[PDB]
Design a protein around this ligand. Structure first.
Ligand SMILES: [Cl-]
Ligand SMILES: [Cl-]
Ligand SMILES: [Cl-]
Ligand SMILES: [Cl-]
Ligand SMILES: [Cl-]
Ligand code: NA
Length: 129
C-alpha cells in the first residue's frame, strides 16, 4: 500500500505516535516519506547482508527475523514480512521499541539527514486529524 501523506498521518496518530517519546507527528511522517516514499512494501538490502523492511525501513540486523541475516537479533519478535503489510500496526509497535532504546529517532538515517532540524510540522499541514 502506498499511503497518502494525510492518510498516513491519521493512521500514525490513531496508533499513538503523536509526541511519542517527545517526537511530534510530523517527524514520523517525514521519516516515512524519505525512508520508503510512504510504500509499505519497500525493501532495501544493506552491505552487511541485512535488509530493511516496510514504511519505516526496519533492519533485520536487530529488529525482525527474515531467516537470511545470520547472527542477527529479532528484538521486536516478528517476522520481517509482517512489516510489509498494509496494516501499519506491526511497524508502529516495533518503531516504538526502537525510538525508546536511547538514540531516539537518530536510528533512522533519513530522519537525521533530511528531517531533523527542519520544520517538520509542514508534513501534517492541511490534514484533518
Ligand atoms: Cl508526499
Ligand atoms: Cl509535527
Ligand atoms: Cl536470520
Ligand atoms: Cl491499522
Ligand atoms: Cl530523544
Ligand atoms: Na534478524
Amino acid at each position: 500500500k502506498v499511503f497518502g501523506r494525510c492518510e498516513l498521518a491519521a493512521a500514525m496518530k490513531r496508533h499513538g505516535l503523536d509526541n511519542y517519546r517527545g517526537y511530534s507527528l510530523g517527524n514520523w511522517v517525514c521519516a516515512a516519506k524519505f525512508e520508503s516514499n510512504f510504500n509499505t512494501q519497500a525493501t532495501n538490502r544493506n552491505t552487511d547482508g541485512s535488509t530493511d523492511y516496510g514504511i519505516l525501513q526496519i533492519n533485520s540486523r536487530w529488529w525482525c527475523n527474515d531467516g537470511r541475516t545470520p547472527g542477527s537479533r529479532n528484538l521486536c519478535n516478528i517476522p520481517c514480512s509482517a512489516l510489509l503489510s498494509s496494516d501499519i500496526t506491526a511497524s508502529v509497535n516495533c518503531a516504538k521499541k526502537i525510538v525508546s532504546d536511547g538514540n531516539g529517532m537518530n536510528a533512522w538515517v533519513a530522519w537525521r539527514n533530511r528531517c531533523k532540524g527542519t520544520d517538520v510540522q509542514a508534513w501534517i499541514r492541511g490534514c484533518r486529524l
